[PDB]
RNA sequence: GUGGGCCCCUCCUGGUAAGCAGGACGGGCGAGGCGGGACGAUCCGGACGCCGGGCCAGGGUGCGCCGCCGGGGCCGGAACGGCGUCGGCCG
RNA sequence: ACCCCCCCCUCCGGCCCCGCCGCCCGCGCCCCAGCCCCGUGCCCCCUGCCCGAGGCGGCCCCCGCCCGGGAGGACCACCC
């Protein structure tokens, strides 16, 4: 073919301003910029609707239209939901502990597996963490950003390692639960 | 956000090639390499080119599917397209392109000694 | 073929070459880093090494096997007469690292400076700031002139020399070093304090503290022209070696054809 | 230089001899004449009297653009006498104006031993 | 006798390096800026692991003799151009002593005029879906001291030509005005029959 | 560069076979020495006449009107380092010699396979409802557009004689 | 005078093989300048008195270094693996 | 990531500032984008061929030993 095209519908909800593949998404949770200026795009806003397509593709350029499109949905969910990962603190024998701190940009982790060093782990800006007021050891993150949602809770992940041990046997740490939306 | 697209009736300029120098009209596609191209109001027989001679104007003539040279001609002269390009910047600057391109050597020692005084007015000029 | 036993190299590469040192005295090289907002302070001073002795205390530790416990420590006794401060030179950060704004003098320098500007000082002829006293006289001089310091450099030092006529020295002419100052709240904070030396005493007590860390540059005792057992540390050849055993005996393969920079020789040592 | 002071030019360059890897061809000149960049537009340059200065006496050297060299422009060039290499990177004058040098602008081996038949008189 | 003064900014290392060699040896003086901003094809990572596998090379028995190998972005780039140079001769050695080579725009070449060459710069050379680097990148990972004194030195500078930009917009109202001269409008419209 | 020609030959004749028959065929060769030679290479496998043993009657050569774009199907075979191979192609070009200059040009690039290593066995014209191949049938449509697919062809070919200036050209689009 | 030869192309014999050893038609170096193959007695061209002009073989034409553009495609080494990319054949 | 590069640390042609106190040379500044490329696809094209202020950038020049001690040392040098 000559072109390579998908189309998303914008919902009424948001405002959208595109321009030099600059995407600035705006509801009531909040405003979120991406910058896809490394890809070459042809994007169309026009008549309530998005346009992506790509000209002459051959090899892996097939692969680009569906991959800015499925990035610009997840920036409307965001911006009229918002996204919450809920993480499972898990352990044998060993409670581990947890505080928020920072007032909610930072969480302390002591006792894994009973361990002296102690664990201090930032958010990336935009994000929150509450302890659960509900169900007990479990964590909420929040926030407008998906990547950033979902990378402060793998670098959460990262930082609680059983070392030099059969980790099918040792299986304590912090696990993702939940990927979704927010429930207002 | 394209602006100029290859199609028929797309009035194009002919960078290179035997033909380069003049205009012409696409009346035909045979791939994303060439075209199918015929200018008969400026002086160019309906031939093959590569779309690496072509450089696409912001101009199109409304034409048949499959014209021939006759049919062409009167439905190029019926369009204003051809001189509102000739009257824009850029048909001003081909213009004297073409009165720059038959210099003899006489005539390049002349074009240069006016240079040296256009050069000298603008700085008796720049000082107030 | 292979080395067959598994030995280290003898000797340091980082301390090439072995020369004898063209400095003149120990020159400070780097200074230690500023710190923006922190209280101002000076970091160097220069004295006279003058002896050694031993001192007891009492060891305040902690898991150590000398908890509670007394030790004798070495300690070695440095003299340090008041240094003046002469001048003030400031610098700016540029592409091509740190270059000088310009040097404000004093209005008046002492005698143990204006000697170090001369080889003979009775014979020579005495013109040293002969036209700079005439103009800094009026004290406005300095303070325009300390007005560029204040609006293009990045760092700031003083320059103080020491008075050899308080030692048991034999020089009578002064040693001149550039001492930085650190902390303050912007640059101009820091050029007001240096004017507020000039030409005035400093005492070690105003830079250095008790329990405090410094670092000592110096230039070593000399031994003149050494071989390689002493200079380098190798081992010593077998008795019945017909030329002599205070050598290296392999100089190198014969391949590559030449001597390596890696192999110990005999020369100046210290 | 008090006979071409007046004459107005067009500038050229003296890149190097005529020469291949292996030898070289000291009695032909490769010259670069700004605004030629073409073998076909090398014409009117073609057949006419340029110079160079040779900055040790403060003279002209005077000679003639014979052929073309390569597709991009570079003409072939003989002057009166063979140039010396310290004179290379040097500009060329192509004069716009015609100039009677005699026969100034012409070879050594076409001046002498170029074959007339000819004699010596003995006056 | 000008000399070509050339933006390095967006050109290709070594289609720049063949146009200012063959310039050198044709008499001209050319000086280089903002050489921290060229361009070198393919990926960082290649080209880092390039650049440090030269810098493996030197004499066994003594490195004073070796092969030195220059880590600011203005050297490597006249270190290229010597490769495209008979340097080791007379006709070679006046050909480097006319070029000049620049991290960033100095007071000494701030008001020159400047030019480009556009078929070696890399948006006209390059596939899109090449990767690319900067030389000043490059320069920092192997032990340039200078890439942020470069920065401060020209923001700097163009915040004080931009201030100047204004006023010089006002000038060219005023010198552009002059229609007024006839001894100038006899000029243009000589040009203009053979234009 | 290719042109086309037509062929009559026949085998030299005898007493057992007065009158012999006569074998036609349709070449396309760079001239008339290669497409005399590429006839008896193809007489001597099909019908075993040697060229010693019989003689060319014609050599016609073909000039075909273009001036209009047509899609044409060539049916060959061809040989690689482990065998032979038959292969189908289709091309939209003006006249019968030029899709065979592009047919060539394409085997030549993407096979690595010459002139001397290909037979072709048939050269059609396909209307345009029974098109097989995706790339050709794209254009074989109504109303076909799309952007100029290189036009920084154009810039930096003025690049090669303007050798410095004073800014970056811009690529219109 | 010579009766130590050797190499290339095709064709062979002993040997795991060898820049190993032994044979065959024709050619070369030996005893052959010049250009090219970065570099080499033998490979690709071309075989030689001393010069001036022209044409051009072999190999090539970003800069070193004499000389280039246009167009159509694609993007040392074995068994054996590859949902890298482009193109085909059979169902 | 014991690896690699930089700091610290050793040597260091050259250069800069300051003390005592003249020469020469040149004449030219937007910036940023290339799947908005904002209306382009130019200018320059005379370094003498008739060009030759102020400011703004460059260039040159400018500094003793012997003698005796030593913490220095083959001789020299080095520090006084
Ligand atoms: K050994
Ligand atoms: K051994
Ligand atoms: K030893
Ligand atoms: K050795
Ligand atoms: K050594
Ligand atoms: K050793
Ligand atoms: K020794
Ligand atoms: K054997
Ligand atoms: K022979
Ligand atoms: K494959
Ligand atoms: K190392
Ligand atoms: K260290
Ligand atoms: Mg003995
Ligand atoms: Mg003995
Ligand atoms: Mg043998
Ligand atoms: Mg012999
Ligand atoms: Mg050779
Ligand atoms: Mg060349």
Redesign the pocket.
Known sequence: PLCSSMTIKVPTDVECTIN??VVTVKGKKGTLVRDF?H?????THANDTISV????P????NALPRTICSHIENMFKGVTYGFEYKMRLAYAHFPIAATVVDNNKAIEIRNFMHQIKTRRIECLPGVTIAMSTNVKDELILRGISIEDVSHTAARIHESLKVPNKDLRKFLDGCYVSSRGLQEQ | ???RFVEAGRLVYLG??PDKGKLAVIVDIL????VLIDGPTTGVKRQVV????A?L??QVINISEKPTTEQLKKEIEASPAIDTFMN???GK?IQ??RLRAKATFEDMGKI??L??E???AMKRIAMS | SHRKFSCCRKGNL????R???????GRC??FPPDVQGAPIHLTAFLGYKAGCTHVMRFIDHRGSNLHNRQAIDQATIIDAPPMICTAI?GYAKTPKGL?????V?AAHIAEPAMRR?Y??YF?AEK???????KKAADGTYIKEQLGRLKQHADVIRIVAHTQPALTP?????A?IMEIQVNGGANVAEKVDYAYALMEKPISIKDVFSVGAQIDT?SIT?????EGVVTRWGVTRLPRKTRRGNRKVACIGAWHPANVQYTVARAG?M? | ?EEI???????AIF??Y??????QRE??A?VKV??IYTRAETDKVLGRLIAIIHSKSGKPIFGKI??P????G?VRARFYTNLPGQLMGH?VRVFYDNIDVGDRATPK?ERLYGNPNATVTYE | ?????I?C??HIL?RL??IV??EL?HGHEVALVRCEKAIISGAFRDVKAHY?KK?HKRTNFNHLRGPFHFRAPAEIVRRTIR????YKTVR?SDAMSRLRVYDGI???C?????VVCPSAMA?LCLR?ERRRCEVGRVAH???W?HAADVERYEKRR?EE??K??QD?IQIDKKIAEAAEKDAELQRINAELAKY | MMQKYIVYGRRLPSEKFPEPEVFRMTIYAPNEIVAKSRFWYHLKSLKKIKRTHGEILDCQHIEENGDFVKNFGVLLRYRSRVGQ??????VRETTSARAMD?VY??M????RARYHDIQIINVKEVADEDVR?E?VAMFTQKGVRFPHPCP???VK??A?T?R??????????
């Open positions: 030099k593949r200026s890809a070459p795009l042809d994007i397509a790509v000209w002459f051959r090899g892996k350029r | 956000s394209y602006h290179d090639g791939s994303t390499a060439a590569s779309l690496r001679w450089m104007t912001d824009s910047v850029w600057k004297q392109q240069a000694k240079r040296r256009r050069k000298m | 980082g301390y090439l070459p020369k004898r040192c063209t400095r003149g005295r090289k780097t030179i270059r000088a704004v310009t040097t003098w500007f080889r003979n014979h013109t040293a700031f002969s036209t700079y006293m020295l034999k020089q009578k002419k040693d540059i005792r000399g031994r003149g022209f100046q210290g | 230089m002071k007046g004459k107005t030019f067009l500038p890149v190097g005529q020469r291949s890897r292996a030898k009695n032909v490769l700004s605004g014979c052929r060299h390569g597709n991009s570079m500009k081996y | 006798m000008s000399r070509i003064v933006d900014k967006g070594g390096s063949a060699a063959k040896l440090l810098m490769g495209m140079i008979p070679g100095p007071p000494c701030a008001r020159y005029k400047r948006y899109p990972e192997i032990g001291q163009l030509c931009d100047w930009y010089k | 191979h038959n292969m189908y192609r289709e592009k040009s394409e030549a690039g993407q096979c191949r790339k920084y062809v154009h070919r003025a090669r303007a410095f200036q004073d800014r970056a050209p811009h690529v219109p689009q």
